[PDB]
Amino acid sequence: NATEIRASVGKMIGGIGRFYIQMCTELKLSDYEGRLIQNSLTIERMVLSAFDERRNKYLEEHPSAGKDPKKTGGPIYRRVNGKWMRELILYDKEEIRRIWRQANNGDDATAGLTHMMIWHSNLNDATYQRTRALVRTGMDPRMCSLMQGSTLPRRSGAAGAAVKGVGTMVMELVRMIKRGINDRNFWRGENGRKTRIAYERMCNILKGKFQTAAQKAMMDQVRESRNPGNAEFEDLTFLARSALILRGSVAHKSCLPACVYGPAVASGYDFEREGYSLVGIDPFRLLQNSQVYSLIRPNENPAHKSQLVWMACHSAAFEDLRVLSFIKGTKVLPRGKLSTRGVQIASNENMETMESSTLELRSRYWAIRTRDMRTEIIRMMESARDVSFQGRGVFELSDEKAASPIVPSFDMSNEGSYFFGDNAEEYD
Ligand SMILES: NC(=O)c1cc(-c2ccc(CN3CCOCC3)cc2)c(C(F)(F)F)[nH]c1=O
């Protein structure tokens, strides 16, 4: 059945590629402009915005975009006489939807919208810090390493649920508990009945992420509370801290930008026939046969901007840096050592100083990713407790059948956390 599962994922990637090729053709973008990641993000947000209809399911937007709910837009960058120009494009949401369905042979293809949303989340995880929002909710700033998918939309649903991390679930459940404390009727009536289902859904989602019997049992007690007060917060926090040692089951999906699938489809690659799997060589091979460009700000180091995108492409912001340095072949520095700022350009930035760089997104090897008395038990379980790769090893790109595993070497002395010494901008 894994052949039938590979065909369905391949169909979805091909439609994203076909949708991008169409959008580039409407906008009259060049090969360079089409391969600019800033343009890709604009094009990807436009389709999410057109299909969202302000539901906060695939995206969240500024009230300025709410001026005309029937139109969606964003910034487009074109290269005019060596310089870079920024223009705002406004398309009809109906026409964007029409183009998406046409690219997906009449199908709604919600699987492709989610993939771009998950790539967008992975990019924010690789770019912005969340330590101020942790302090705001009353959580430990050290919980940074468990904030997978913390930027995902308000009503992301089942698709966003799989990639959200332990600390992300704890942050939204604690934002929920704190709303009850300051509002008397938060758990009352029809609003409180809807709120109650949302609470138990979030609790069962977080419960499923725990791989021990005691952590899952502790979640049942937080979920059984009809009026969660400070007692439910102390238990959520004490469980969040335990995840920083006793690991959880968090899914990481390598979702590449549409300007990667675009050119791959444009050159005749049949994703539906050939198949596609986010696990293994498929995203690694596609990145070796790709050419992505990015706008670079003055005084920014292009190698560091390339690293931001390579980690976002690979869902690697929360992985051990000693593992990534072995796979990429180059040293993967903590965010605190990168002379770079996020790929998205701000509405007030000077375009005259803006230059561009070729992103270096290839890697040396490829690899497979595989993903009270109760408080006394989990506390004792942490005392059992070094770089860990679980797996046969790494492989070269020529070995596509994984028949020749390479055993990895890491300096356990060298940094393992991307968030150590973090000086990245705070998300907002
Ligand atoms: N799609 C993929 O197979 C893919 C996988 C991996 C990846 C991440 C981590 C590990 C090490 N351990 C972690 C625990 O689980 C067992 C494997 C191996 C491979 C990466 C990246 F992070 F290295 F960048 N990127 C990708 O694209």
Three-class secondary structure assignment of the chain: CHHHHHHHHHHHHHHHHHHHHHHHHHHCCCHHHHCEHHHHHHHHHHHHHHHHCCCCCCCCCCCCHHHCCCEEEEEEEEEECCEEEEEEEEEEHHHHHHHHHHHCCCCCCHHHHHHHHHHHHHHHHHHCECHHHHHHHCCCHHHHHHCCCCCCCCCCHHHHHHHCCHHHHHHHHHHHHHHHHHCCCCCCHHHHHHHHHHHHHHHHHHHHHCCCHHHHHHHHHHHHCCCCCHHHHHHHHHHHHHHCCCCCCCCCCCCCCHHHHHHHHHCCCCHHHHCCCCCCHHHHHHHHCCCCEEEECCCCCHHHHHHHHHHHHCCCCCCCHHHHHHHHCCCCCCHHHCCCCCCCCCCCCCCCCCEEEECCCCCCEECCCCCCHHHHHHHHHCCCCCCCCCCCCEEECCCCCCCCCECCCCCCCCCCCCCCCCCCCECC
Which is nearest to 238 in space by CA: 136, 135, 145, 377? 377
Partners of 71 in the beta sheet? Answer: 92
279: its two tokens = 């696990």
Partners of 91 in the beta sheet? Answer: 72
Q: Which atom of ligand 1 is nearest to the CA of 324?
A: 23
Other C-beta atoms closer than 10 Å to the C-beta of 1 total 5
312 and 359 in contact (C-beta within 8 Å)? no
387 and 322 in contact (C-beta within 8 Å)? yes
Residue with the nearest Cα to atom 10 of ligand 1? 369
Residue 369 Cα to ligand 1 midpoint, Å, equals: 4
273: its two tokens = 């026939």
Residue with the nearest Cα to atom 24 of ligand 1? 314
259 and 17 in contact (C-beta within 8 Å)? no
Residue 221 Cα to ligand 1 midpoint, Å, equals: 34
Partners of 295 in the beta sheet? Answer: 356
Partners of 358 in the beta sheet? Answer: 293
CA distance 47 to 72: 8
CA distance 253 to 163: 7
| 206 burial level (CB within 10 Å; 0-12, 13-18, 19+) | buried
Cα–Cα distances (Å) from 202 to 76, 205, 227, 250, 385, in that order, read 37, 5, 15, 14, 28
| Cα 134 versus chain centre, distance | 18
Tokens 């008395």 sit on residue: 373
Cα–Cα distances (Å) from 184 to 7, 172, 226, 319, in that order, read 51, 19, 13, 41
354 and 295 in contact (C-beta within 8 Å)? yes
After which residues does a break in the chain occur, C–N more than 2.5 Å?
371, 385
Residue with the nearest Cα to atom 17 of ligand 1? 369
Residue 394 Cα to ligand 1 midpoint, Å, equals: 10
Integer Rg of the chain from CA? 22
Ligand 1 neighbours, Cβ below 6 Å, are 254, 278-280, 283-284, 314, 316, 319, 323-324, 327, 367-371, 389-391
Residues whose CB falls within 8 Å of the CB of residue 334, separated by 6 or more in sequence, listed in order: 321, 415, 417, 418, 419, 420, 421, 422
Which is nearest to 236 in space by CA: 147, 174, 150, 164? 174
CA 305-310-311 angle, to 5 degrees, is: 100
410: its two tokens = 């890491």
Residue 18 Cα to ligand 1 midpoint, Å, equals: 28
Q: Which atom of ligand 1 is nearest to the CA of 280?
A: 3
387: its two tokens = 């770089």
CB-side neighbour CA atoms (13 Å) of 257: 27
CA distance 305 to 223: 42
Residue 253 Cα to ligand 1 midpoint, Å, equals: 9
Residue with the nearest Cα to atom 8 of ligand 1? 369
Cα–Cα distances (Å) from 224 to 60, 63, 176, 316, 420, in that order, read 31, 37, 15, 35, 37
Residue 370 Cα to ligand 1 midpoint, Å, equals: 8
CA distance 235 to 215: 10
CA 342-116-399 angle, to 5 degrees, is: 90
Which of the listed residues 6, 253, 319 should we mutate to test ligand 1's pocket, taking the one with most ligand atoms within 8 A of CB? 319
| Cα 418 versus chain centre, distance | 15
| 94 burial level (CB within 10 Å; 0-12, 13-18, 19+) | exposed
Which is nearest to 394 in space by CA: 361, 369, 362, 360? 369
Residues whose CB falls within 8 Å of the CB of residue 428, separated by 6 or more in sequence, listed in order: none
Cα–Cα distances (Å) from 180 to 2, 188, 277, 378, 384, in that order, read 45, 10, 42, 28, 37
CA distance 79 to 110: 33
Q: What sign results for the dihedral spanned by CA atoms 175, 176, 181, 185?
A: positive
Which of the listed residues 125, 369, 397, 418 should we mutate to test ligand 1's pocket, taking the one with most ligand atoms within 8 A of CB? 369
Residues whose CB falls within 8 Å of the CB of residue 283, separated by 6 or more in sequence, listed in order: 254, 256, 313, 314
Other C-beta atoms closer than 10 Å to the C-beta of 395 total 22
CA distance 200 to 220: 9
CA distance 100 to 279: 26
CB-side neighbour CA atoms (13 Å) of 44: 32
Residue with the nearest Cα to atom 11 of ligand 1? 389
Q: Which atom of ligand 1 is nearest to the CA of 323?
A: 11
CA distance 103 to 88: 24
Other C-beta atoms closer than 10 Å to the C-beta of 193 total 11
Residue 383 Cα to ligand 1 midpoint, Å, equals: 27
Q: Hey, what amino acid is at 290?
A: S
Residue 278 Cα to ligand 1 midpoint, Å, equals: 10
Tokens 């302000």 sit on residue: 54
Technique employed here was X-ray
Residue 388 Cα to ligand 1 midpoint, Å, equals: 12
Q: Which atom of ligand 1 is nearest to the CA of 327?
A: 23
CA distance 121 to 315: 9
- Resolution given for this structure, in angstroms: 2.7
Residue 140 Cα to ligand 1 midpoint, Å, equals: 27
Residue with the nearest Cα to atom 25 of ligand 1? 314
